[PDB]
Amino acid sequence: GKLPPGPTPLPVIGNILQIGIKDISKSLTNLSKVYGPVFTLYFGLKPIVVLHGYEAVKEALIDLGEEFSGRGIFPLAERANRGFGIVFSNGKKWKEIRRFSLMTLRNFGMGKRSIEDRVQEEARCLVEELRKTKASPCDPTFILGCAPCNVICSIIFHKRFDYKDQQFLNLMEKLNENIKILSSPWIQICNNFSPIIDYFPGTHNKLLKNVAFMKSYILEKVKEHQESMDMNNPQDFIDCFLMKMEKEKHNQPSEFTIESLENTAVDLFGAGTETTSTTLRYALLLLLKHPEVTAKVQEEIERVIGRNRSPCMQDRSHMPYTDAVVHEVQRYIDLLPTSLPHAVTCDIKFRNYLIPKGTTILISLTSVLHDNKEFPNPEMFDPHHFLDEGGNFKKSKYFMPFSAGKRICVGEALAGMELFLFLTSILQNFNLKSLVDPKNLDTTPVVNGFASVPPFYQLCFIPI
Ligand code: HEM
Ligand SMILES: CCOC(=O)NC(=O)c1ccsc1NC(=O)c1nc2cnccc2s1
To answer: Where would you find this protein in the cell?
Structure first.
């Protein structure tokens, strides 16, 4: 090797990296091999305490659940006055709003129409829309995004929309824009480790504008609801919230305000749309990649549900294989590898450490969902991670895709309904045909700053 002469070396070419959440999570696991299950990362003078492995996560989020139930401060969210909902609130405000929302989402105050009724209706509309693709190759991203968005619409203001309604398209457009901004990959430039969009000029303003747009649209619905508010006839989240505001009068200052109603409603759209959509889209990809799994799901659907009626949640206890498949989708894909960041609510002694009030806590959900003792070969998609040796469904304490403790996803039950009812309804009515031969079908996730996101794929929905 004797290359021609030339100038003194220039900067490095083609080695600037877009860091996704799955790469962050891999580094966290690597660091746990050096420092153990509880360690601190410093970003300048800001410490972040990482919890890695089931025993650390359980001891903190569950055994000390109150102390680890804080959210912390996010500056851009504070500019949008977002701390007045569920996701970003803390202390007394969070406790009452999350409790109120939980019970509303378990059919208290929501009228006769159950949450399951609303999901079932959306499931039938979802199947109709898949029919309209006429078995031609289809990128399912849009249709699978509409259905969970429509479920939240029906819960919050008792309205679902045709997938071509402009009002509905406008709302999803802003939600998709915000999700794209907020979940962009990371990058290190000089002594800075930052989201990429922090460099992109219009991003922070577009996020604030879209959030203002969404709150303003919800406010328009709230005013309509105020015209007929009826303590004896609430029928959606807005009605329930307004009834609570009525009962909390004279007890000022209430946590329940129009400002709190708008941020809670925005929270539910942002937390409940793209998580479910992305899990569904990933589910269909895994079902294309694993045709023998799909055949057994469809066999189980035929013998428990048949083809004459819609799936319902009572069917799931009789469909252990399908239940294992849905669980395994969520465990395998590891949708939110580091959940959402917590903070401790007070000074707390934790093992040999003293964690001051307000310290950021980062939870490795990957380290639990992919525990190689609880789930041997955890890198592999295998419904038998949730079946015992007799083929019965096997619940795991390591099933934490909604996190754990006091901040566990408030939509856990609703998301489980949407996953089970939508996937069984699709597979009750359609065979899935991949253009690619399954053996050559790529399932490697794409880089994303917050979530595990599946690659692009198309498929045919072939009616039965
Ligand atoms: C496959 C679907 C879903 C997954 C995997 C999921 C997962 C999660 C996770 C990991 C968190 C963070 C928990 C923590 O901070 O430790 C969370 C929070 C949250 N989720 Fe979900 N979620 C899903 C769907 C939904 C749906 C349908 C709703 C509708 C209500 C929802 C509402 C929320 C809310 C409001 C929070 C904030 C809770 C709080 O800060 O107290 N999610 N979710
Ligand atoms: C977690 C980091 O968030 C941030 O750093 N957000 C911001 O900086 C920000 C600024 C304006 S709006 C907004 N975030 C949201 O509205 C979210 N809603 C939900 C609902 N479920 C899950 C996640 C979100 S983030």
So the answer is: Endoplasmic reticulum membrane; Microsome membrane
CA distances (Å), origin 221, targets 145, 218, 226, 435: 22, 5, 9, 43
Q: CA-to-CA distance for 162 and 172, rounded, in angstroms?
A: 12
In angstroms, what is the span from residue 334 Cα to ligand 1's centroid? 13
The structure tokens listed for 39 are 């360690």
**CATH number of the domain enclosing 154:** 1.10.630.10
Q: Which atom of ligand 2 has the smallest separation from the CA of 75?
A: 8
The distance of Cα 127 from the centroid of its chain, to the nearest Å, equals 22
Residue of 73, 82, 279 to test ligand 2 pocket, by largest number of atoms within 8 Å of CB:
82
Full residue range of the structural domain in which residue 232 is found: 1-464
**340 CA: nearest ligand 2 atom:** 1
CA nearest neighbour of 198 among 181, 177, 178: 181
Instruction: Report which residue type is found at 411.
Output: G
Rounded to the nearest whole angstrom, what is the distance from the C-alpha of residue 234 to the centroid of ligand 2? 29
Which technique?
Answer: X-ray
b/e code 19-36 from CB counts within 10 Å (16+ = b)? bbbbebbeebbeebeeee
339 Rama sector, left if φ>0, alpha if ψ -120 to 50, beta otherwise: left
Distance from Cα 211 to the centre of ligand 2, integer Å:
10
Q: Tell me the structure's resolution in angstroms, rounded to a single decimal.
A: 2.0
Identify the DSSP state of 315: G
Q: How far apart are CA 141 and CA 153, in angstroms?
A: 19
Is 409 annotated among the ligand-binding residues? yes
